[PDB]
From a paper:
APOBEC3s (A3s) are an APOBEC subfamily in mammals that restrict viruses, including retroviruses, endogenous retroelements, Hepatitis B virus, and Epstein-Barr virus. The double-domain A3G, A3F, A3D, and single-domain A3H (haplotypes II, V, and VII) are active in restricting [name]-1 through deaminase-dependent and independent modes, with A3G being most potent among them. For the double-domain A3s, the deaminase activity resides only on CD2, but the catalytically inactive CD1 is important for regulating nucleic acid binding, processivity, oligomerization, packaging into [name] virion, and effective anti-[name] activity. In order to understand the structural basis of domain organization and molecular regulation of the complex biological functions of A3G, we determined the double-domain structure of rA3G.
The E/Q construct was crystallized in different pH and salt conditions but consistently showed the same structure and dimerization via CD1-CD1 interactions, primarily through direct packing of several residues on h6 (K180, L184, A187), loop 1 (I26) and loop 7 (F126, W127) from both subunits. While the FKL structure shows a canonical fold of its CD2 domain, the E/Q structure shows significant alteration in CD2 conformation, with major changes on helix 2 (h2), loop 3, loop 4, and the Zn-active center. The long h2 of the CD2 in the FKL structure has become a short 310 helix (h2′) in the E/Q structure, resulting in a disordered 14-residue stretch spanning parts of loop 3 and h2 (residues A246 to E259). The shift to a short 310 h2 and extended random coil structure is necessary to avoid clashing in this tight packing conformation. However, this also disrupts the conformation of the CD2 Zn-active center within the regions of h2 and loop 3 that become disordered, resulting in no Zn-coordination. When aligning the FKL and E/Q structures via their CD1 domain, the CD2 domain of the E/Q structure shows a rotation of ~29° compared with the CD2 of FKL structure, causing the E/Q CD2 domain to shift ~15 Å downward and ~8 Å toward CD1, and resulting in a much closer packing interaction with CD1. In the E/Q structure, the two domains interact mainly through h3, h4, and h6 of CD1 with h2′, β2, loop 4 and loop 10 of CD2. Additionally, E/Q* carrying individual mutations F126Y, K180S/L184S, or CD2Δloop3 (as in FKL structure) are all active, even though the activity of the FKL* construct (with E259A reverted back to E259) with the combined mutations is less than E/Q* and WT. These results suggest that even though the crystallized E/Q structure, lacking Zn in the CD2 domain, represents a catalytically inactive A3G structural state, reverting the catalytic residue back to E259 can fully restore its deaminase activity comparable to WT. Full-length rA3G dimerizes through a hydrophobic CD1-CD1 protein interface and dimerization generates an area with intensified positive electrostatic potentials (PEP).
Author numbering:
A (entry chain B), B (entry chain A): 4 to 142, 147 to 245, 260 to 383
Write the structure that this text describes.
Amino acid sequence: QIRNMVEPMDPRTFVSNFNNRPILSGLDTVWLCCEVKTKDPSGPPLDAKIFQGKVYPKAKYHPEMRFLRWFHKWRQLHHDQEYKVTWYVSWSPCTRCANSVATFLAKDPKVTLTIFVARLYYFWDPDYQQALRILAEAGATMKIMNYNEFQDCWNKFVDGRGKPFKPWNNLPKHYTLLQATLGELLRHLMDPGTFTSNFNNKPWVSGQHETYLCYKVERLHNDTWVPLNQHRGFLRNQLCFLDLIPFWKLDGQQYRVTCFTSWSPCFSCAQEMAKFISNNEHVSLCIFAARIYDDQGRYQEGLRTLHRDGAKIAMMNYSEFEYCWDTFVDRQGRPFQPWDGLDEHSQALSGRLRAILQNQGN
Amino acid sequence: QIRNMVEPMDPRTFVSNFNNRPILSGLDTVWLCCEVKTKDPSGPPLDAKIFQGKVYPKAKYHPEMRFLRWFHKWRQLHHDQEYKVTWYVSWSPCTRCANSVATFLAKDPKVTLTIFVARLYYFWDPDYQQALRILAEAGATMKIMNYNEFQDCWNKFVDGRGKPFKPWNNLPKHYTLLQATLGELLRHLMDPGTFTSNFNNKPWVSGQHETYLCYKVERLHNDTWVPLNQHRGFLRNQLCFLDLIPFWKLDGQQYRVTCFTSWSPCFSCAQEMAKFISNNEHVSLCIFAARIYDDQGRYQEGLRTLHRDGAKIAMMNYSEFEYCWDTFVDRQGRPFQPWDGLDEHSQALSGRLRAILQNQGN
Ligand SMILES: [Zn+2]
Ligand SMILES: [Zn+2]
């Protein structure tokens, strides 16, 4: 019935925009064919729609955001239930739309999203590989469109007047390239050089102008925090990573999120993490900072506010460094080798942080 | 200063043939820039040369084979030592040249080969992905040419008359695509569907017209066969796999090769494995067949000769099936689920094989 429910796109526009030659400078257009289904797969689609947009700035007007708005207005017209949404989108999401879809997925337990992309947008760019990793960890299922999916979206969203789908040359080769690229950038771990040069806890002299953040999640069963291998991650910063962890898909009740950040939070990061832990009673937050970040301003009140709201704040020592080497770094079997005076420096940093967080005088 | 030793190629030819846009139908030339060094990086090159060929049949005339012949004649003119060979080749090797380079590397303890490829030849084709895996397990180091390598072989092998190397557009994007592809096809494991449809041991009715073969190697230390995770593998067949395992690239003395083949060897495979196990006393061979292959001919005497020459020949039961599910299959965490009557069928097949191999009557 999808044909009834959509107003189809021209065969030429489909062939033009879903051609999956990986590099395609000239396509300023995104097309997003979406279908909405119930929990069980035998059921027919409740609705479907085609969205269009441009790749260039003002992302509010990107088809992903248009879908989010349309879907928000659509769910209010139907009894509340669990939905499975499938996308056939000609370009992979941008950084901002990845963030927005990830927030939406992490805060909604009743929505499942599968995204089939024809081409990866900016697969060479570390920000976008991170964007796809964020989307995947929020719970979206990222895939490359293969022959079957082009056939399906020809049949369902294109005015293929009885016409069968006829592939262009090199469709499977482009799929091979794109699916290898997506698989690797999804399974990517931190580089050893950037780990040891960003988590090094000696006084700043060089570099380190970015924040690096590893995180693990555990949940509570029988008063013992059992780990959840499936939702570890690491992020690079120049809002709030806790808005991207789906605290609902992890087996229920309560959670503890352990955080290893190369720099201690600046003021607004502390404010946002405090607001989150205050609006989400079921989550405990543990922070481990390699270094204290002095933003010349309100960082101290930020850390104190974060501490008063239940977060535990400490500095990384040997075991946290080794843990993040083993877990989040592409170590290649090589073991963690600490820099000189790591323990010394971390004890001094612990002293400054304790002075910072100290409330009552002795 | 390789330039002394080579006659450089034209800049036009270099830009034309080493352009690394992944798909390039129109280049049927291969160019192979080779440099030979001793075993340390500080040393200068002893020699270097450029080879050319065509991609299309008669592979004896492919630049890989030309290098093998030239190198064979070259080593006989120099005091024997350990060599490190580096290749800058515009296309990755074909199946046959992958086989021959792999055999050469596996038989030779004094040669180290690193192959930097600009483009992957037939990356979409399972035979060629297998070819690259064969090359890698023989000990060759496969890599994609990046900006640095194009710069290096511009400087060393091209008549860039003082001119520096100026990249074409999309060089790094193509590198990202190609190295994601190479990494994926290198780390590839067997598909679950093809595993259980090829190693299923109930009587043939459908398919199974190809042979699938997993293998692991152990070596002997302290009268206990210690495993060697790094030299496992699996191959698909329509010379002899033991000719591709480098029995010399690990703790010496002696080895045991355990082989799990979906079909028992046909006659000529048995004769070739017998010749290998006879010409290499330091290697023990264990065969596990899922099914007996009756080629209408001399398969029985083949198995019997293989047994006389020291190989141990058995049929797979639950433990071998489960082992290869765990080790060589992309199981995805999913556990091995045996088919009905697996054990029965394996006992009957073991009985037939025992009748086959039986020498003396009782
Ligand atoms: Zn966007
Ligand atoms: Zn060849």
